[PDB]
Amino acid sequence: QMQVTDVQDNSISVKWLPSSSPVTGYRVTTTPKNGPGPTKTKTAGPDQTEMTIEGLQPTVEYVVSVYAQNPSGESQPLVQTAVTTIPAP
């Protein structure tokens, strides 16, 4: 379960349900679904389950992936969704 909290022209805000298993942190990945360009990564601690991703392009569809880190150090895919930025004003 993941919710998109806000979509702007250059940013996306998301919030995800906490991991069921023990978790030492999260990794959030943001990537253009179709059209090439760079992938953004940001990490959070286990008590942050929301994030705003900035520096995005307008009218681009992005995949947002959340990975959960367990104590062994493994990073496991938790939830992902596609979000499209709205156009510039």
Domain that holds residue 11: 1-89
Give which of 78, 27, 34, 63 is closest to 48, Cα–Cα: 27
Please report, for the domain that includes residue 85, its CATH number.
2.60.40.10
Which method resolved this structure? X-ray
CB 83 within 8 A of CB 7: yes
CB count within 10 Å of CB 74 equals 10
Give which of 15, 33, 9 is closest to 85, Cα–Cα: 9
Q: Exposure string (b/e) for 48-59, b if CB count within 10 Å is 16 or more?
A: ebebebeebeee
**Helices H / strands E in the chain, number of each:** 0, 7
The number of distinct structural domains making up the chain is 1
